Amino acid sequence: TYTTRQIGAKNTLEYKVYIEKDGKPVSAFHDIPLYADKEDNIFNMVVEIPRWTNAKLEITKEETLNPIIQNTKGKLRFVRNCFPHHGYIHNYGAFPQTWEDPNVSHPETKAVGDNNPIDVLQIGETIAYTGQVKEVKALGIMALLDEGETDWKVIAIDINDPLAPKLNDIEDVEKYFPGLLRATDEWFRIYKIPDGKPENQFAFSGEAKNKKYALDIIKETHNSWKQLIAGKSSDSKGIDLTNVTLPDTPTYSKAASDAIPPASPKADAPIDKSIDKWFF
Template identity: 45%
Template sequence: MSFTIEERGRPNTQEYRVFFKNSEGKYISPFHDIPIYANEAENIFHAVVEVPRWTNAKMEIATKDPLNPLKQDVKKGNLRYVANVFPHKGYIWNYGAIPQTWEDPGHKDSDTGCCGDNDPIDICDIGSKVCSRGEIIKVKVLGTLALIDEGETDWKVIVINMEDPEASDYNNIDDVRRLKPGYLEATFDWFKRYKVPDGKPENQFAFNGEFKDRDFAIKTVKSTHEFWKALISSKTNAGELNCMNTSVSDSPFCCSGGDAEAVVHAVSSCYIHTIHRIRVDKWFYYDK
């Protein structure tokens, strides 16, 4: 199973979109049409890379837009870039999401005591490869960190790309701690402080910031898949989410290939000539 992307608009503008196609060249939703499993028997999952390692533009699956393309997050009318909080530069992993999952905002998690954040579950790929925006990778789950973001449960699942030459050496969260010393501590620090330069307080965590192991993480991912199933079948109210898809045959939101093409063609394919100068090299320092 292979996937390709089609970019529309100019990067670093609010019009920029990244649409997805399947192996037949048909437009699909990365949220709903890419299968959660690459190999269900071995608990290998697909993941959509939204933000390549070392980059700053906060790209994300547009859950409220038809076909859910990637677009850059906007806050107060401005494109959003994560700050470099010393010693970190941009995102320190390939960051993305597992398709066909959903953190239900109407479900209070029994472990964290908070409801979900209304998004697909997030992944941090610790593999050595710097992936491309929109790349679909097959990942092994190693553990998870329970971020509490403005009162919502926002799981960060630690994974490794199955194409990484050292993937066979990583099977649980303790392997990361042993083979990449300092990486988990840096991950915790990154999520704790990345919003501080924007004037927000440090983020909080469930379990006192402890990383949970592989089995816990896989169970969490699978539970969000069940929430997604209820969403895509309209058993749960979608609210503002757009569940348009082209492959979930029993979904009331399933559309034709022609309808999907119309969505994409309605988005400008022309580059906007305005030059947007971005500054993402500044370092932010503050006393821990």
Template identity: 50%
Template structure:
């Protein structure tokens, strides 16, 4: 199963979008149409790369837009770039989401005591390859960190790209600790402090910031898949979320290929990119 992207608008502007197509050239939603599983028997999942490692632009699946293209998040009306908190530069993994998952904002997690953040579940790919924006990768789940972001449960699932030459050595969270010493500590530090330059307090965590193991993480991913199933079948209220899709045959939100193409064609034509502001390279320092 292969996927391609089609960029519309001008990169580094508010009209920039990344749409997705399947191997037949049909426009699809990366939220709803890409299967969660690449290999269900082996618990290999698909993941959508929203933010390649070392970059700062806060790209994300636009959950409220038709076909859910990638677009850059806004903060106070301006394009959002994640600050560099020393010693980190941009995102320190390929960051993205697992399709066909949803952290239900009406479900209080029994472990964290907080409701979901209304988004697909997030992944941090620790593989060596720096992926490209919109790339679809196959990943092994290794563990998870339970971030509590402004009172909401926001799982960060640690994964490795199955095509990584070292993927066979990584099967659980302890393998990350052993083979990439310092990476989990850096991950915790990154999520704790990344909003501080924006004037916000440090983020909090469930389980005292402890990373949970592979089995716990896989169970968490699978539970968010069940929430998504209820969402896409209209058994739960979608609220502002856009569930337009082209392949979930029993979904009341399923649309024709023509309707999907009309969404893409209504977006701005692809054009030259704007420069990234020089302020994005600034490093922020503060005492832990």
């Protein structure tokens, strides 16, 4: 996408993240393709959860979509610091341009699909870029069945980062990052534990596929989101489609950019000392 605007905050509850594309705002999940960068190579992705971070920000329902500190009980959602590890490790992306239809769950995914786009986790040597739009190639794919919701795990890396031609499938890692697998598997369950959510239960007995399953899963991810733009296609379009990158959608308001107020970066808001808590 390019650069983004920092809406001063980081927790408070006003920190509005807005990524900008070239010369003007943008829109993740919409104004963010994917199969870009050597169609026969990989694609770009967005970030909204740097490693070692108890914070969790998303992007949906706002206009152009943007990460945030999800709420629910009037307050920022801080992910527990599970004993093993720290806060949030893996980074997190969200191959924007896709949508996990709640219904349609393909074979081997009863929990059908969900709302939020797709979850992507890249093990890039460098930290995250809370909205940092960097490239990366898909490796393996992980699936997690939680609260009747078809969840999947994508493996992407900074194609530009070292270990490029080194990682091109699941097998690898084990040799390079032999401990990133099972390390991710659980960490997810307990992720809900200290919060009111016991375990989850990974799909496929608990095994993940390779890029083959990723590319496909990632492919049928955009299409499901593409065949949606159409207009009414989806019988349930609860979100902002508006896209100035598709003059073929009754939502091409290329004027929804200037409207976006200029960035207002303030300062990282202090986080309750409750976080940094190793929940065993």
